[PDB]
């Protein structure tokens, strides 16, 4: 290189420094996806039951039976576009950054923009899926598709609170009594081995670990996970913790409000779902939908190019009565 | 101690988000106006204060208010990293530069008056009234230090 | 005495580091460098010693000198490494925290 | 909504920097007077040698 016309330099490399994107919950594969044909969906419910039976003297009158429930509901799906262009002036007389001889090319800009588009769509899907677990649709700045699944189905939140200033009260026993009994009663099936998982904000998790009723049990003789000497979960990004057959997963993504955690079981059939719809173009209008559409173009007059991307989906929580909203006082 | 450094942020296609490709007259969207490149009173080699996205009136004077807003400076001489034009001109001389006028979509956040302040809510009408779409729905970008 | 300093140190340093690494949270490792008085104050904190008074451990900071007879009084705790700097270049009462493995973080040039 | 205004993307940064380097000399010489007529410090009567001074 040069630092002037008459003398030279020593050019010594380049840096990348790209930010990190979290993918914790996406790895767990909680959701099942159905590719639809329109912007509306139907769901139906059918609840059975049973009843008590009295004693009646031989002869005389008798007693009779009763019938069951039915219910049905509808929804609709939002839209998420994204676009960008490129022009002549963006690549004329420009070096390709990182090398001191090569000139700029039109292919690199397109590839980099495609990479940005893919990353942004992945982030969108992660955030929207995170939103469903809390019990609401995502639809940001689109009041058409704001659904409170509790209100849509008619369920209740059942907030189980824990105040960490009460050293004489064991939070795990409160969790059991208030959350696990409800989960067991309201499963709806006859299976009896549900696993309970807690996803908590970093503040709530850290405040929990410091509670005397929790640290006391592990302090008197060695344990497999020396929570009081060795950092929980090793050196990984997020602290996994096991306790009383309740798996605790730390959420460092920074979207769960600091002070709240949500308790839900695994394996309940058709509890989480997402539906896709086709984009608004004559090729796809009224045809089978697809996850992500990307259109690339170049004006036949040869003076600029355009990149387009579109997608539309909705995230559903079919059984909101089985997500317990915790909270913490400090 | 003040290590020499340089920076690049944005480019031409980051302001003109969209353009209507007129047929036949490819210059249907632009106008050429003579502007004072080097300040009338300044050092013989003082860099010009003009920056891309500055609002300009019909006579080439930078627009200081919604009244004088006619177009947006777009010419290649003022884009980032084009500093090689320093010293070529002389104070007080007027040089033509291209302005964007009509049939475009403009990023609002990069439109600023001559003073550098953000575009005014009243001046936006002039640009929009010229046959342009001033928009704010820009995805933006986030770098290290932001959780995604 | 009512708060464990290691918790605040983690919440600050690891939180800052994981976000500003720039590539990904690929199981980073942390290291701490501190002066004599800072090290002694850290060790003397009851919340730290409480974790070792009940059952034996490898270091056994309660009975055996940390790092053995050798110098630099090294120490590890909660998968975090602590080192006592006796060179005197570390300002009194101060400590520095940085991760290992970061590429191009440090370089030296010759002419 | 389906039909309304769309959204647009941002761009990255390309900062650059350069630096200088310092220099450090260190020299020493020796003379006859320092060696010829001084006994070696570690012995009773061994005359000093230039080699020890160099080392």
Coordinates of C-alpha atoms in Angstrom, one line a residue:
Chain A
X1 CA 0.0 0.0 0.0
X2 CA 0.9 3.7 0.3
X3 CA 0.6 6.5 2.7
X4 CA 1.2 9.1 0.0
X5 CA 2.6 9.3 -3.5
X6 CA 6.3 8.8 -2.7
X7 CA 6.4 6.1 0.0
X8 CA 4.9 2.9 1.1
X9 CA 3.1 1.1 4.0
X10 CA 2.6 -2.4 5.5
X11 CA -1.1 -3.5 5.2
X12 CA -1.8 -6.2 7.7
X13 CA -5.3 -7.8 7.4
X14 CA -8.9 -7.2 8.2
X15 CA -11.6 -7.7 10.9
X16 CA -15.1 -9.1 10.9
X17 CA -16.8 -8.3 14.3
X18 CA -20.3 -9.6 13.5
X19 CA -23.0 -9.6 16.3
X20 CA -24.5 -12.7 17.8
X21 CA -28.0 -14.0 17.2
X22 CA -29.5 -16.4 19.8
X23 CA -31.3 -19.6 18.8
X24 CA -32.0 -21.3 22.1
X25 CA -35.7 -22.1 21.8
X26 CA -35.6 -22.8 18.0
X27 CA -33.4 -25.8 18.8
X28 CA -36.1 -27.4 20.9
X29 CA -38.6 -27.7 18.0
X30 CA -41.8 -27.0 19.9
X31 CA -43.9 -26.3 16.9
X32 CA -45.6 -28.1 14.0
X33 CA -46.2 -26.2 10.7
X34 CA -49.1 -26.4 8.2
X35 CA -48.9 -24.8 4.8
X36 CA -52.3 -23.3 4.0
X37 CA -54.1 -21.7 1.1
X38 CA -55.7 -18.6 2.5
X39 CA -55.6 -16.0 5.3
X40 CA -58.1 -17.7 7.6
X41 CA -58.0 -20.8 9.8
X42 CA -60.5 -23.0 11.6
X43 CA -60.2 -24.7 15.0
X44 CA -62.7 -26.9 16.8
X45 CA -63.1 -28.3 20.3
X46 CA -65.0 -31.3 21.7
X47 CA -65.0 -31.8 25.4
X48 CA -66.5 -35.0 27.0
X49 CA -67.2 -35.6 30.6
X50 CA -68.7 -37.9 33.3
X51 CA -71.0 -37.5 36.3
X52 CA -72.1 -38.8 39.7
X53 CA -74.6 -41.6 40.3
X54 CA -77.0 -41.8 43.2
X55 CA -78.7 -44.7 45.0
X56 CA -82.4 -45.4 44.4
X57 CA -84.7 -48.0 45.9
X58 CA -85.6 -51.0 43.8
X59 CA -88.5 -50.1 41.6
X60 CA -89.6 -46.4 41.7
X61 CA -88.0 -43.7 39.5
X62 CA -84.6 -43.8 37.8
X63 CA -82.0 -41.3 36.8
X64 CA -80.7 -40.1 33.4
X65 CA -77.6 -38.8 31.7
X66 CA -76.4 -35.6 30.0
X67 CA -74.5 -34.5 26.8
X68 CA -71.2 -32.9 25.9
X69 CA -69.7 -29.7 24.5
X70 CA -68.7 -28.3 21.1
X71 CA -66.9 -25.1 20.1
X72 CA -65.4 -23.5 17.0
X73 CA -63.2 -20.5 16.2
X74 CA -61.5 -18.6 13.4
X75 CA -58.4 -16.5 12.9
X76 CA -56.4 -14.6 10.2
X77 CA -52.8 -14.1 9.3
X78 CA -50.5 -11.0 8.9
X79 CA -47.9 -10.0 6.2
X80 CA -44.2 -9.2 6.4
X81 CA -42.5 -7.6 3.4
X82 CA -38.9 -6.5 2.9
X83 CA -37.1 -5.1 -0.1
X84 CA -34.0 -3.2 -1.3
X85 CA -32.4 -2.0 -4.5
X86 CA -28.9 -1.2 -5.9
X87 CA -27.7 1.3 -8.5
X88 CA -24.7 2.1 -10.7
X89 CA -23.2 4.7 -8.4
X90 CA -22.8 2.1 -5.6
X91 CA -20.0 0.2 -7.4
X92 CA -18.2 2.6 -9.8
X93 CA -14.7 3.5 -8.8
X94 CA -14.8 1.7 -5.5
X95 CA -12.3 -0.8 -4.2
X96 CA -13.6 -4.1 -2.9
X97 CA -13.0 -3.6 0.8
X98 CA -10.3 -5.9 2.2
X99 CA -8.1 -6.1 -0.9
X100 CA -5.8 -3.3 -2.3
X101 CA -6.1 -4.1 -6.0
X102 CA -9.5 -5.6 -6.8
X103 CA -12.3 -3.2 -7.9
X104 CA -15.8 -3.5 -6.7
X105 CA -18.2 -6.0 -8.3
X106 CA -22.0 -6.1 -8.6
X107 CA -22.2 -9.8 -7.4
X108 CA -20.8 -9.2 -3.9
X109 CA -23.3 -6.5 -3.0
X110 CA -26.2 -8.8 -4.0
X111 CA -24.8 -11.7 -2.1
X112 CA -24.3 -9.6 1.1
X113 CA -27.8 -8.2 0.8
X114 CA -29.2 -11.7 0.5
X115 CA -27.3 -12.7 3.6
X116 CA -28.8 -9.8 5.5
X117 CA -32.3 -10.6 4.3
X118 CA -32.0 -14.2 5.5
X119 CA -30.7 -13.2 8.9
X120 CA -33.5 -10.7 9.4
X121 CA -36.2 -13.2 8.5
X122 CA -34.7 -15.8 10.8
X123 CA -34.6 -13.2 13.7
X124 CA -38.3 -12.3 12.9
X125 CA -39.4 -16.0 13.1
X126 CA -37.5 -16.5 16.4
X127 CA -39.1 -13.4 18.0
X128 CA -42.6 -14.2 16.8
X129 CA -42.3 -17.7 18.1
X130 CA -41.1 -16.4 21.4
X131 CA -44.2 -14.2 21.5
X132 CA -46.5 -17.2 21.2
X133 CA -45.2 -18.9 24.2
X134 CA -46.3 -15.9 26.3
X135 CA -49.8 -16.3 25.1
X136 CA -50.3 -13.7 22.4
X137 CA -49.8 -13.3 18.6
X138 CA -47.0 -11.2 17.3
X139 CA -48.5 -8.8 14.7
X140 CA -46.3 -5.7 15.6
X141 CA -47.9 -2.4 14.8
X142 CA -50.8 -4.3 13.1
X143 CA -53.8 -4.2 15.5
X144 CA -55.7 -6.5 13.2
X145 CA -54.0 -9.6 14.4
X146 CA -53.5 -9.1 18.1
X147 CA -55.0 -12.2 19.7
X148 CA -55.0 -13.0 23.4
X149 CA -55.2 -16.8 23.2
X150 CA -56.5 -16.8 26.8
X151 CA -59.3 -14.5 25.7
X152 CA -59.8 -16.2 22.3
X153 CA -60.4 -19.6 24.0
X154 CA -61.6 -18.2 27.3
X155 CA -58.9 -19.5 29.6
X156 CA -57.2 -18.0 32.7
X157 CA -53.6 -16.9 33.4
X158 CA -53.2 -18.5 36.9
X159 CA -50.3 -16.3 38.0
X160 CA -48.1 -18.1 40.5
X161 CA -46.1 -15.5 42.3
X162 CA -42.8 -15.8 44.3
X163 CA -41.5 -13.1 46.6
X164 CA -37.8 -13.6 47.3
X165 CA -37.7 -11.4 50.3
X166 CA -39.3 -14.2 52.4
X167 CA -36.4 -16.3 53.5
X168 CA -38.6 -18.6 55.5
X169 CA -40.7 -19.8 52.5
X170 CA -39.5 -22.3 49.9
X171 CA -40.3 -21.1 46.4
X172 CA -40.2 -24.7 45.0
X173 CA -43.0 -25.8 47.2
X174 CA -45.1 -22.8 46.1
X175 CA -44.3 -23.7 42.5
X176 CA -45.4 -27.3 43.1
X177 CA -48.7 -26.5 44.9
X178 CA -49.8 -23.8 42.5
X179 CA -48.5 -24.8 39.1
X180 CA -47.9 -28.5 39.0
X181 CA -51.3 -29.4 40.5
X182 CA -53.0 -27.2 37.9
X183 CA -50.9 -28.8 35.1
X184 CA -51.7 -32.3 36.2
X185 CA -55.4 -31.6 36.5
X186 CA -55.8 -29.8 33.2
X187 CA -53.8 -32.0 30.9
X188 CA -56.9 -33.5 29.5
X189 CA -55.4 -36.9 28.7
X190 CA -54.8 -39.9 30.9
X191 CA -51.1 -40.0 30.5
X192 CA -49.2 -39.3 33.8
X193 CA -45.6 -38.5 33.2
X194 CA -45.4 -34.8 32.2
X195 CA -42.1 -33.1 32.3
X196 CA -42.1 -29.5 33.7
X197 CA -39.8 -26.9 32.2
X198 CA -39.2 -23.4 33.4
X199 CA -38.0 -20.6 31.1
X200 CA -37.0 -17.6 33.2
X201 CA -35.5 -14.1 32.8
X202 CA -31.9 -13.8 33.8
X203 CA -32.8 -11.6 36.8
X204 CA -35.4 -13.9 38.2
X205 CA -33.1 -17.0 37.7
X206 CA -30.2 -15.3 39.4
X207 CA -32.3 -14.1 42.3
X208 CA -33.7 -17.7 42.7
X209 CA -30.2 -19.3 43.0
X210 CA -29.3 -17.0 45.9
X211 CA -32.3 -18.0 48.0
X212 CA -31.3 -19.7 51.3
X213 CA -33.9 -22.4 50.9
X214 CA -32.3 -23.5 47.6
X215 CA -28.6 -23.1 48.5
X216 CA -28.9 -24.8 51.9
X217 CA -29.8 -28.2 50.4
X218 CA -26.6 -28.4 48.3
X219 CA -24.1 -26.9 50.8
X220 CA -23.5 -29.8 53.2
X221 CA -22.1 -32.6 51.1
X222 CA -20.8 -33.0 47.5
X223 CA -23.3 -33.1 44.6
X224 CA -23.0 -33.9 40.9
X225 CA -23.4 -30.2 40.0
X226 CA -21.5 -28.1 42.6
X227 CA -23.8 -25.1 42.1
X228 CA -22.1 -23.3 45.0
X229 CA -18.5 -23.8 43.7
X230 CA -18.8 -24.3 40.0
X231 CA -20.7 -22.1 37.6
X232 CA -24.0 -23.8 36.6
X233 CA -24.0 -25.5 33.2
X234 CA -20.2 -25.1 32.8
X235 CA -18.9 -22.3 30.5
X236 CA -21.9 -22.3 28.1
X237 CA -23.6 -19.1 27.2
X238 CA -26.8 -19.8 29.3
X239 CA -27.0 -21.6 32.6
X240 CA -28.8 -24.9 32.6
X241 CA -29.9 -26.0 36.1
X242 CA -31.6 -29.2 37.3
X243 CA -33.5 -29.2 40.6
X244 CA -36.4 -31.3 42.0
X245 CA -37.0 -32.8 38.6
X246 CA -37.7 -29.3 37.1
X247 CA -35.3 -28.3 34.3
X248 CA -34.4 -24.6 34.5
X249 CA -33.3 -22.9 31.3
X250 CA -31.7 -19.4 31.5
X251 CA -33.0 -16.9 28.8
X252 CA -30.2 -14.5 27.8
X253 CA -31.9 -13.4 24.6
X254 CA -33.2 -10.4 26.6
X255 CA -36.8 -10.5 25.5
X256 CA -38.6 -12.2 28.4
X257 CA -39.4 -9.2 30.8
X258 CA -36.9 -9.1 33.7
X259 CA -38.8 -10.6 36.6
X260 CA -41.1 -13.1 34.9
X261 CA -40.8 -16.8 34.0
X262 CA -43.2 -19.2 32.3
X263 CA -43.9 -22.8 33.4
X264 CA -45.1 -25.3 30.8
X265 CA -45.0 -29.0 30.2
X266 CA -43.6 -31.0 27.3
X267 CA -45.3 -33.3 24.8
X268 CA -48.9 -32.2 25.0
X269 CA -50.3 -32.9 21.6
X270 CA -51.1 -30.0 19.2
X271 CA -50.3 -27.4 21.8
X272 CA -48.1 -25.1 19.6
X273 CA -48.7 -24.5 15.8
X274 CA -47.9 -22.1 13.0
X275 CA -49.7 -21.6 9.7
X276 CA -48.3 -20.1 6.5
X277 CA -50.2 -18.4 3.7
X278 CA -49.3 -17.5 0.1
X279 CA -48.0 -14.1 -0.9
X280 CA -49.9 -11.6 -3.0
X281 CA -48.8 -12.3 -6.6
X282 CA -50.6 -13.9 -9.5
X283 CA -48.2 -16.8 -9.4
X284 CA -49.0 -17.7 -5.8
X285 CA -52.3 -16.0 -5.2
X286 CA -54.7 -18.8 -4.1
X287 CA -52.0 -21.5 -4.5
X288 CA -50.2 -23.6 -1.9
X289 CA -48.0 -21.5 0.4
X290 CA -44.3 -21.6 1.0
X291 CA -42.1 -20.5 3.9
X292 CA -40.0 -17.6 2.3
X293 CA -40.3 -16.0 -1.1
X294 CA -37.4 -14.1 -2.7
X295 CA -37.6 -12.3 -6.0
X296 CA -34.5 -11.1 -7.8
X297 CA -34.7 -8.8 -10.8
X298 CA -32.6 -6.6 -13.1
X299 CA -34.1 -3.9 -15.4
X300 CA -33.8 -4.8 -19.0
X301 CA -32.6 -1.2 -19.6
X302 CA -29.6 -2.1 -17.5
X303 CA -29.3 0.7 -15.0
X304 CA -30.3 -0.8 -11.6
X305 CA -31.3 -4.0 -9.9
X306 CA -34.0 -4.9 -7.3
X307 CA -34.3 -7.6 -4.6
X308 CA -37.6 -8.5 -2.9
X309 CA -38.7 -10.9 -0.1
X310 CA -42.1 -11.7 1.4
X311 CA -43.6 -14.0 4.0
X312 CA -46.8 -14.3 6.1
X313 CA -47.4 -16.5 9.1
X314 CA -49.2 -16.7 12.4
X315 CA -48.2 -18.5 15.6
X316 CA -50.9 -20.3 17.7
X317 CA -51.2 -21.5 21.3
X318 CA -54.0 -24.0 21.3
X319 CA -54.0 -24.7 25.0
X320 CA -53.1 -21.5 26.8
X321 CA -54.4 -22.8 30.1
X322 CA -51.2 -24.8 30.4
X323 CA -48.7 -21.9 30.5
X324 CA -48.4 -20.5 34.0
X325 CA -47.2 -16.9 34.2
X326 CA -44.8 -16.5 37.1
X327 CA -43.6 -13.3 38.7
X328 CA -41.0 -12.2 41.2
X329 CA -40.9 -9.6 44.0
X330 CA -37.6 -8.2 45.1
Chain B
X1 CA -1.2 10.7 19.0
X2 CA -4.3 11.4 16.9
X3 CA -4.0 8.3 14.6
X4 CA -5.4 9.1 11.2
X5 CA -8.6 7.2 10.5
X6 CA -11.4 7.2 7.9
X7 CA -14.9 5.9 7.9
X8 CA -17.6 4.9 5.4
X9 CA -21.3 4.7 6.1
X10 CA -24.0 4.5 3.5
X11 CA -24.0 5.1 -0.2
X12 CA -26.1 6.4 -3.1
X13 CA -28.7 3.6 -3.1
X14 CA -29.2 4.1 0.7
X15 CA -31.0 7.4 0.1
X16 CA -32.9 6.8 -3.2
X17 CA -34.7 3.6 -2.1
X18 CA -36.8 3.4 -5.2
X19 CA -37.0 5.1 -8.7
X20 CA -39.6 5.1 -11.4
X21 CA -37.8 4.1 -14.6
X22 CA -39.2 6.6 -17.2
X23 CA -39.1 5.3 -20.8
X24 CA -37.2 7.2 -23.4
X25 CA -36.1 10.1 -21.1
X26 CA -34.1 8.3 -18.4
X27 CA -33.3 11.7 -16.9
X28 CA -37.0 12.4 -16.2
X29 CA -36.3 12.3 -12.4
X30 CA -33.3 14.6 -12.2
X31 CA -32.4 18.3 -12.7
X32 CA -29.0 20.0 -13.1
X33 CA -28.3 23.3 -11.2
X34 CA -25.2 25.3 -10.7
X35 CA -24.1 25.5 -7.1
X36 CA -21.2 27.1 -5.2
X37 CA -19.0 24.1 -4.4
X38 CA -16.3 25.8 -2.4
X39 CA -17.7 28.4 0.1
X40 CA -17.5 32.0 -1.2
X41 CA -15.3 32.9 1.8
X42 CA -13.0 30.2 3.1
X43 CA -9.5 28.8 2.8
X44 CA -8.2 28.1 -0.7
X45 CA -8.3 24.4 0.1
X46 CA -11.2 24.1 2.6
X47 CA -13.4 21.1 2.0
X48 CA -17.0 21.9 0.8
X49 CA -19.7 21.7 3.4
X50 CA -22.2 20.1 1.1
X51 CA -23.4 16.6 2.1
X52 CA -25.6 14.1 0.4
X53 CA -29.3 14.4 1.2
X54 CA -29.2 18.2 1.7
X55 CA -32.3 19.9 0.5
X56 CA -31.7 22.5 -2.2
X57 CA -34.0 25.0 -3.9
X58 CA -34.5 25.7 -7.6
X59 CA -31.6 28.3 -7.7
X60 CA -29.1 25.9 -6.1
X61 CA -29.1 27.6 -2.7
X62 CA -29.2 25.1 0.1
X63 CA -32.7 25.0 1.6
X64 CA -32.8 26.3 5.2
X65 CA -36.6 26.1 5.5
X66 CA -39.6 24.3 4.0
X67 CA -40.2 27.3 1.7
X68 CA -37.0 26.8 -0.2
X69 CA -37.1 23.0 -0.5
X70 CA -37.2 21.8 -4.1
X71 CA -34.9 18.8 -4.4
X72 CA -32.3 16.6 -2.8
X73 CA -28.6 16.8 -3.8
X74 CA -27.6 13.4 -5.2
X75 CA -24.6 14.1 -7.4
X76 CA -21.6 11.8 -7.3
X77 CA -19.2 14.6 -6.2
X78 CA -20.6 14.6 -2.6
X79 CA -21.0 10.9 -1.9
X80 CA -19.0 9.4 0.9
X81 CA -15.4 8.5 0.1
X82 CA -15.2 10.8 -3.0
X83 CA -12.9 13.3 -1.2
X84 CA -10.4 13.2 -4.2
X85 CA -12.1 16.4 -5.6
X86 CA -10.5 18.5 -2.8
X87 CA -8.4 21.4 -4.1
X88 CA -9.6 21.2 -7.7
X89 CA -12.0 24.1 -7.5
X90 CA -11.6 27.7 -6.4
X91 CA -13.7 29.7 -3.9
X92 CA -16.7 31.4 -5.4
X93 CA -17.0 29.3 -8.5
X94 CA -20.3 27.6 -9.3
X95 CA -20.4 24.0 -10.7
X96 CA -23.4 22.0 -11.9
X97 CA -24.6 19.2 -9.7
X98 CA -27.5 16.8 -10.2
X99 CA -30.6 17.1 -8.1
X100 CA -33.4 14.5 -7.6
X101 CA -36.9 16.0 -8.1
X102 CA -39.7 13.6 -8.9
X103 CA -40.8 10.0 -9.2
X104 CA -38.7 8.5 -6.4
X105 CA -38.9 7.0 -2.9
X106 CA -36.8 8.9 -0.4
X107 CA -35.4 7.8 3.0
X108 CA -36.7 10.5 5.4
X109 CA -34.1 9.8 8.0
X110 CA -31.2 11.0 5.8
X111 CA -32.9 14.2 4.6
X112 CA -31.6 17.3 6.4
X113 CA -31.5 21.0 5.9
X114 CA -28.4 22.9 5.1
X115 CA -27.7 23.2 8.8
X116 CA -27.8 19.4 9.1
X117 CA -31.0 19.3 11.2
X118 CA -33.6 16.7 10.3
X119 CA -36.2 17.4 7.7
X120 CA -39.2 19.4 9.0
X121 CA -42.7 17.9 9.1
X122 CA -43.8 20.8 6.9
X123 CA -41.0 20.6 4.3
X124 CA -41.9 16.9 3.7
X125 CA -45.0 18.1 1.9
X126 CA -43.0 19.8 -0.8
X127 CA -41.0 16.7 -1.6
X128 CA -44.1 14.5 -1.4
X129 CA -46.1 17.0 -3.5
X130 CA -43.5 16.7 -6.2
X131 CA -44.5 13.1 -6.9
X132 CA -42.3 11.3 -4.4
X133 CA -42.9 8.9 -1.5
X134 CA -41.2 10.0 1.7
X135 CA -41.1 6.9 3.9
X136 CA -40.0 5.8 7.4
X137 CA -40.6 2.0 7.3
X138 CA -36.8 1.3 7.1
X139 CA -35.7 -2.0 8.7
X140 CA -32.4 -0.5 9.9
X141 CA -29.4 -2.4 11.0
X142 CA -27.8 -3.4 14.4
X143 CA -24.2 -4.2 15.2
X144 CA -22.1 -5.8 17.9
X145 CA -23.4 -4.9 21.4
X146 CA -27.0 -5.5 20.5
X147 CA -28.8 -8.7 21.4
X148 CA -30.5 -10.4 18.4
Chain C
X1 CA -21.3 -9.2 53.3
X2 CA -24.9 -9.7 52.1
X3 CA -24.0 -10.2 48.4
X4 CA -21.5 -12.5 46.8
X5 CA -19.0 -10.3 44.8
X6 CA -18.6 -13.1 42.2
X7 CA -22.3 -12.7 41.2
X8 CA -21.9 -9.0 40.4
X9 CA -18.6 -9.6 38.7
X10 CA -20.2 -12.2 36.4
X11 CA -23.4 -10.2 35.7
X12 CA -21.2 -7.3 34.6
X13 CA -18.2 -9.0 32.8
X14 CA -19.7 -12.0 31.2
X15 CA -22.8 -10.1 30.1
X16 CA -20.6 -7.5 28.5
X17 CA -18.2 -10.0 26.9
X18 CA -20.8 -12.4 25.4
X19 CA -22.5 -9.6 23.6
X20 CA -19.4 -7.9 22.3
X21 CA -17.5 -11.0 21.3
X22 CA -18.5 -10.3 17.7
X23 CA -18.8 -13.9 16.2
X24 CA -20.7 -16.2 18.5
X25 CA -20.9 -17.4 22.1
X26 CA -18.7 -20.4 21.3
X27 CA -18.0 -21.4 24.9
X28 CA -15.7 -18.5 25.9
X29 CA -13.3 -18.6 28.8
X30 CA -12.6 -15.8 31.2
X31 CA -9.5 -14.7 33.1
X32 CA -9.0 -12.3 35.9
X33 CA -5.9 -10.3 36.8
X34 CA -5.8 -8.4 40.1
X35 CA -3.4 -6.8 42.6
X36 CA -2.5 -8.2 46.1
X37 CA -5.1 -6.3 48.1
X38 CA -7.9 -7.0 45.7
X39 CA -7.0 -10.7 45.8
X40 CA -6.9 -10.8 49.6
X41 CA -10.2 -9.0 49.9
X42 CA -11.8 -11.4 47.5
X43 CA -10.5 -14.4 49.5
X44 CA -11.5 -12.9 52.8
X45 CA -15.2 -12.5 51.8
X46 CA -17.3 -14.9 53.9
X47 CA -19.6 -15.7 51.0
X48 CA -16.6 -17.2 49.2
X49 CA -15.1 -19.2 52.1
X50 CA -18.5 -20.6 52.9
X51 CA -18.4 -22.9 49.9
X52 CA -15.3 -24.8 51.2
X53 CA -15.7 -25.1 54.9
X54 CA -18.0 -28.2 54.8
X55 CA -16.4 -30.9 52.7
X56 CA -12.9 -31.2 51.2
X57 CA -11.9 -29.9 47.8
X58 CA -8.9 -29.8 45.5
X59 CA -7.6 -26.3 46.4
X60 CA -8.6 -26.3 50.1
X61 CA -7.9 -22.6 50.5
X62 CA -8.7 -22.9 54.2
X63 CA -5.7 -25.0 55.1
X64 CA -3.2 -25.0 52.2
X65 CA -1.7 -21.9 50.5
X66 CA -3.3 -21.2 47.1
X67 CA -1.0 -22.1 44.2
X68 CA 1.4 -23.9 46.6
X69 CA 4.7 -22.4 47.7
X70 CA 5.1 -20.9 44.2
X71 CA 4.4 -17.3 43.5
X72 CA 1.5 -15.5 41.8
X73 CA -1.0 -17.1 44.2
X74 CA -3.2 -18.4 41.4
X75 CA -6.8 -19.4 42.1
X76 CA -9.8 -20.8 40.3
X77 CA -13.4 -20.6 41.3
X78 CA -16.7 -21.1 39.5
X79 CA -14.8 -21.8 36.2
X80 CA -13.1 -18.4 36.5
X81 CA -9.3 -18.0 36.9
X82 CA -7.8 -15.5 39.3
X83 CA -4.1 -14.5 39.3
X84 CA -2.2 -12.4 41.7
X85 CA 0.0 -9.9 39.9
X86 CA 3.2 -9.1 41.9
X87 CA 5.0 -7.3 39.1
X88 CA 3.5 -4.0 40.4
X89 CA 2.3 -2.8 37.0
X90 CA -1.3 -3.4 38.0
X91 CA -2.6 -0.3 39.9
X92 CA -3.2 -0.8 43.6
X93 CA -6.8 -2.0 44.3
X94 CA -7.6 -2.6 40.6
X95 CA -8.2 -5.7 38.5
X96 CA -8.8 -6.5 34.8
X97 CA -11.0 -9.0 33.1
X98 CA -10.6 -10.3 29.5
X99 CA -11.3 -13.6 27.7
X100 CA -8.9 -15.9 26.0
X101 CA -9.0 -17.0 22.4
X102 CA -10.2 -13.8 20.8
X103 CA -8.3 -13.5 17.5
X104 CA -6.3 -10.4 16.6
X105 CA -7.1 -8.9 20.0
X106 CA -3.4 -8.4 20.8
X107 CA -0.6 -7.8 18.3
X108 CA 3.0 -6.7 18.3
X109 CA 4.8 -5.2 15.3
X110 CA 8.5 -4.9 14.5
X111 CA 10.4 -2.5 12.2
Chain D
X1 CA -51.0 -4.9 5.1
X2 CA -51.4 -6.5 1.7
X3 CA -50.9 -3.7 -0.8
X4 CA -49.4 -0.9 1.3
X5 CA -46.0 0.6 1.6
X6 CA -43.0 -1.8 1.9
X7 CA -39.8 -1.7 4.0
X8 CA -36.1 -1.2 3.1
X9 CA -32.8 -2.4 4.4
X10 CA -29.7 -0.7 5.9
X11 CA -26.0 -0.9 5.2
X12 CA -22.7 -1.6 7.0
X13 CA -19.6 0.3 8.0
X14 CA -16.0 0.2 6.8
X15 CA -13.8 2.1 9.3
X16 CA -10.0 2.2 8.7
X17 CA -7.0 3.2 10.7
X18 CA -3.1 3.3 10.6
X19 CA -0.4 3.6 13.2
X20 CA 3.4 4.4 13.7
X21 CA 6.2 2.7 15.4
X22 CA 9.0 3.9 17.9
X23 CA 12.7 3.1 18.1
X24 CA 15.0 2.2 21.0
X25 CA 18.8 2.2 20.9
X26 CA 21.3 1.0 23.6
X27 CA 25.1 1.1 23.3
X28 CA 28.3 0.8 25.4
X29 CA 32.0 0.7 24.9
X30 CA 35.1 -0.5 26.9
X31 CA 38.6 0.8 27.4
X32 CA 42.0 -0.5 28.3
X33 CA 42.1 1.1 31.7
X34 CA 39.2 -1.0 33.0
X35 CA 41.0 -4.4 32.5
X36 CA 44.8 -4.2 32.5
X37 CA 45.6 -3.6 36.2
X38 CA 42.6 -4.8 38.2
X39 CA 42.4 -8.2 39.8
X40 CA 39.3 -10.4 39.1
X41 CA 36.8 -9.7 41.9
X42 CA 36.1 -13.5 42.4
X43 CA 39.7 -14.6 43.0
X44 CA 42.8 -13.6 45.1
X45 CA 45.3 -12.8 42.3
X46 CA 43.7 -13.6 38.9
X47 CA 44.2 -10.6 36.6
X48 CA 41.0 -9.3 35.0
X49 CA 40.2 -10.4 31.4
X50 CA 38.3 -8.5 28.8
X51 CA 36.0 -11.5 28.1
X52 CA 34.2 -11.3 31.4
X53 CA 33.6 -7.5 30.9
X54 CA 32.1 -8.2 27.4
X55 CA 29.8 -11.0 28.8

